[PDB]
Scaffold this active site. Structure first.
Site, short mmCIF file in Angstrom:
data_model
loop_
_atom_site.label_atom_id
_atom_site.label_comp_id
_atom_site.label_asym_id
_atom_site.label_seq_id
_atom_site.Cartn_x
_atom_site.Cartn_y
_atom_site.Cartn_z
N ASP B 54 0.81 -1.28 0.00
CA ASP B 54 0.00 0.00 0.00
C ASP B 54 0.81 1.29 0.00
O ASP B 54 1.68 1.45 0.82
CB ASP B 54 -0.81 0.11 1.25
CG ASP B 54 -1.61 -1.12 1.54
OD1 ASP B 54 -1.54 -2.16 0.82
OD2 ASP B 54 -2.29 -1.07 2.56
N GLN B 70 4.19 0.57 2.38
CA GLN B 70 4.37 -0.66 3.17
C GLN B 70 5.54 -1.37 2.50
O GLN B 70 5.54 -1.48 1.28
CB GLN B 70 3.11 -1.53 3.00
CG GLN B 70 1.88 -0.91 3.87
CD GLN B 70 2.12 -1.14 5.35
OE1 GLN B 70 1.92 -2.24 5.83
NE2 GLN B 70 2.71 -0.14 6.06
O1 LIG Z 1 0.60 -4.41 4.94
C1 LIG Z 1 -0.59 -4.29 5.71
C2 LIG Z 1 -1.56 -3.35 5.01
O2 LIG Z 1 -2.03 -3.90 3.75
C3 LIG Z 1 -3.47 -3.94 3.73
O3 LIG Z 1 -3.80 -5.28 4.09
C4 LIG Z 1 -4.06 -3.60 2.37
O4 LIG Z 1 -3.26 -4.22 1.35
C5 LIG Z 1 -3.91 -2.94 4.82
O5 LIG Z 1 -5.26 -3.19 5.26
C6 LIG Z 1 -2.82 -3.10 5.89
O6 LIG Z 1 -2.59 -1.94 6.72
#
Ligand SMILES: OC[C@H]1O[C@](O)(CO)[C@@H](O)[C@@H]1O
Ligand SMILES: OC[C@H]1O[C@](O)(CO)[C@@H](O)[C@@H]1O
Ligand SMILES: [Cl-]
Ligand SMILES: [Cl-]
Ligand SMILES: [Cl-]
Ligand SMILES: [Cl-]
Ligand SMILES: [Cl-]
Lengths: 526, 523
Positions: B54, B70
């Protein structure tokens, strides 16, 4: 001209039929001698040389299956129409017969068009066929001038026939040129004929005539008018009762319709053949109970003719190439027929056209793969070089997560192939030619009903020949027939899952025997 | 005090953050040092080494664009969540920044999950993010345990931050594990937060909170509950006001929905992001006026986050590879973001997401092909070797008799390609990967409205990068983003018409510049 139905046939010879037949034979043998076999069928009917179209004169008579077909014996495009002929005892080993008809009568001088063959009350076969003229005497700019003709075999083998002349004239006043493709049958104590007409208001029609003696005809009525006013003509009409397993008879009306506009997945081809199911009381008009449905959902299928033998209704179609480019036309031949299919009604009451049971005798062997799983997107090789094979497979729809899955056939070294697949986003079976390197491309998608889609299983029976594929879905509930002009080199077959798993409960390959029609002595395997 | 909104943040350090950051830098560097660039983006954001997902912390602040994301710094599949960071003064030339966050507090000890950045009333940036724990203390087998956290940057460069701890706890009994992905914004005199929740009855919701000082929060209500009972969670919620064609404000709610069943061409991916347009009286429930629609109809798109800069709402999505095989994962990286898009409303009232106007600055040149016609089924080569290019074309639908027509991209010598086409039988723009030699295949089809079909013209703006395609339909009225893992050799682009004619009124190609994140490259 109120009597466009003569009391005795009008016979008007203008050429020597045997000399015209002899010319036609020479033309075909010369194309056969030089013919390129790359896409030539090993187990479908084609001319040994030249262009064909509609199947004609279909019958079982005096211990033989007969198939005639519209033939141009002088080239690989449509031209002066003749009838070619093949026969067999078993629908597996066929013999090339003499060319049957060549234009020789005034009312047919520009072509011997489509027709049919019926066995009469005395067990003797009679042919009915359309005689073609150009209306302006010279070409198509002025439209067509067509009448109905009749002929009798000279022998039980049908190696030749004697023309009797015109039995039904055209009231040109009352029609827009199109006036052809007769089929004759008996119901009760009366013989009926139907053929296709474009009315004066350019509406596609089927007319009904009757007779007690088969040669003198009386106009009864308009049997059917196409509900779509864009449809101006109904070629190759069919009209036959089909029994359910419940003891009832439905009348199935068939026609090759010209003028429909394509819509979504329906009516995509230049012209489109299809049927309606309904009821009929003799003399009366057809009452449909279903909307129009295609006989065959593929790229290349037109002009089906069916015939009845011992309670069986068998149908052939012409695999029609209407769209450029047409690569096979440079090879000394053009066009083939489908395999023979049996017409039945299925459990939902719709028409089903499985291959005739005799087609099982094409199988030289069985390579049984058992059940096969792809756990994720991937492909398995089923053949490295498959020239003429049948693949039977059952997909477990319930367990397969794949979004699309099936077979790539004619999968060559250049990366070209034709894809036969179940597509779970549209809920259909497709033949997709996007990746083909020769011929026109595009895809065609055959419908599955809600019950077929909620079913746990999908059956496919796929016939690959050197130039074509035919896909029989759920035992012929739908069929797709399409040309597939394989590129050079070895022609693989791959099982394919896209974007999820594929569970196949059964997968079998069978190599196909030759039906004996490709034989040509100038071609030395050597 | 188990009440779930602490009066002051709960700060609970358990690890040395600098040392955890140093370890993550070493992990990313090891993957970067061995990276294979065959599919690595020339002009999209990816990690220099490792898996991303994300987009996070999106903002413009102190003269720079910032994108966080992420990051798993130790492998090319998903794993202990960190935030990576790139920045740019122009959106054209980007630089890699230090990894921003590693897990260092008790409540995020199994991952620093998604979150966002907002500029406060004093012009100072604040971060909001989810702290993740495994509910059983080990693995995903017992589910998630998640709370909301906050942090402040230590400098105007956002190269590091001071964490402040947990500001919103989880009321265990009212929630079925899922509780994450905060977005904060101001309406009138009040700051609001929403995040996604799976209710005790397993329904996907966005809860609403309000704050005076951005740090202490007060629960307000459930902002929205997804009307499909199969949807159990709404990841990465979005909520923002957009000016319609008449100058009126509409509220567009967005989320990444988990649990929808695929139906026809809709909701085909493992999870699916999209929006509804409607109204909001501040502090109240969202009132949809439209059914759910996808942000992007392509194979690989999820977790979009949006942010506001000088009146413009700009959005990035993650190109999510949820389906095996994922061949890029062998290459020391996995995952890229989309180009940045601007959210607007079109004349028909629907969302439009065109590339932001700054993307025109990617173009090194323009090769104007003019009008091209194919008279019957056929192909024409447009580019013999296109690594990173944008093609703009307008097709005349009224004149073209082809059943299907478009562009084969990544067309390699083995006969593999990805096909971007108008499909006249379904009246849609499709991206079809059936012929690709690498990665999962399938197709995706974006809808055209009756009015779009009736107009007689179709515009495509196609961005090809080393491992991806993005197709912008009719100005970004629809978009399809998909990975396309080209085979070896020269990668052609071909215009294709099937079974009829193709009239293309305009065709332009532009080579794309590098955004500089790949550093030295081989063409
Ligand atoms: O990496 C964890 C993140 O990725 C998600 O699952 C969406 O892809 C979010 O809901 C979470 O914060
Ligand atoms: O070859 C001429 C024959 O072909 C058809 O047009 C159908 O394809 C028939 O109407 C005709 O009798
Ligand atoms: Cl249909
Ligand atoms: Cl083989
Ligand atoms: Cl073979
Ligand atoms: Cl849809
Ligand atoms: Cl390039």
């Amino acid at each position: 001209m109120t009597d466009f139905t003569p009391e005795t046939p009008v016979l008007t010879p203008i050429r020597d039929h045997a000399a015209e037949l002899a010319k036609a034979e020479a033309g075909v043998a010369e194309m056969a001698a030089k013919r390129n076999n790359r896409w030539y069928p090993k187990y479908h009917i084609a001319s040994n040389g030249g262009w064909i179209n509609d199947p004609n004169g279909l019958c079982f008579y005096k211990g033989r299956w007969h198939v005639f077909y519209q033939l141009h014996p002088y080239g690989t495009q449509w031209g002066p129409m003749h009838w070619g002929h093949v026969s067999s005892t078993d629908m597996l080993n066929w013999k090339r017969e003499p060319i049957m008809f060549a234009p020789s009568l005034e009312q047919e001088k520009d072509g011997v068009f489509s027709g049919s063959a019926v066995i009469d009350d005395n067990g003797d076969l009679r042919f009915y066929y359309t005689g073609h003229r150009w209306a302006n005497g010279h070409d198509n700019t002025g439209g067509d001038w067509q009448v109905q003709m009749t002929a009798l075999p000279d022998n039980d083998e049908l190696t030749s026939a004697t023309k009797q002349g015109m039995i039904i004239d055209c009231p040109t006043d009352k029609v827009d040129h199109h006036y052809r493709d007769p089929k004759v049958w008996k119901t009760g104590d009366t013989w009926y004929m139907t053929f296709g007409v474009s009315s004066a208001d350019k509406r596609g029609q089927m007319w009904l005539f009757s007779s007690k003696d088969m040669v003198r005809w009386e106009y009864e009525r308009v049997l059917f008018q196409h509900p779509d006013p864009d449809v101006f003509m109904l070629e190759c009409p069919d009209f036959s009762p089909i029994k359910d397993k419940d003891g009832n008879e439905k009348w199935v009306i068939g026609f090759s319709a010209m003028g429909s506009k394509p819509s979504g997945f329906m009516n995509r081809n230049v012209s489109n053949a299809g049927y309606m199911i309904g009821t009929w009381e003799p003399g009366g008009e057809f009452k449909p109970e279903t909307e129009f449905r295609l006989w065959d959902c593929g790229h290349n299928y037109y002009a089906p003719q069916s015939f009845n033998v011992d309670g069986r209704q068998i149908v052939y179609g012409w695999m029609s190439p209407f769209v450029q480019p047409i690569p096979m036309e440079d090879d000394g031949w053009c066009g083939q027929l489908t395999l023979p299919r049996e017409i039945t009604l299925g459990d939902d009451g719709d028409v089903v056209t499985a291959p005739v049971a005799e087609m099982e005798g094409l199988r030289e062997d069985t390579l049984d793969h058992g059940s096969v799983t792809l756990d994720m997107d991937g492909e398995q090789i089923i053949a490295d070089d498959a020239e003429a094979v049948e693949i039977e497979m059952t997909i477990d729809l319930a367990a397969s997560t794949a979004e699309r899955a099936g077979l790539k056939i004619h999968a060559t070294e250049d990366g070209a192939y034709t894809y036969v697949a179940y597509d779970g986003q549209i809920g259909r079976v497709v033949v997709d030619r996007q990746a083909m390197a020769n011929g026109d491309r595009g895809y065609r998608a055959a419908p599955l009903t809600d019950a077929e889609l909620a079913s746990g299983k999908l059956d496919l029976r796929v016939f690959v020949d050197r130039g074509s594929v035919e896909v029989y879905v759920n035992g012929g509930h739908q069929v797709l027939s399409s040309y597939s002009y394989a590129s050079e080199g070895p022609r693989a077959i791959k099982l394919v899952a896209e974007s999820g798993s594929l569970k196949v409960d059964s997968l079998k390959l069978h190599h196909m025997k030759s039906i004996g029609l490709e034989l040509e002595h100038h071609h030395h395997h050597h």
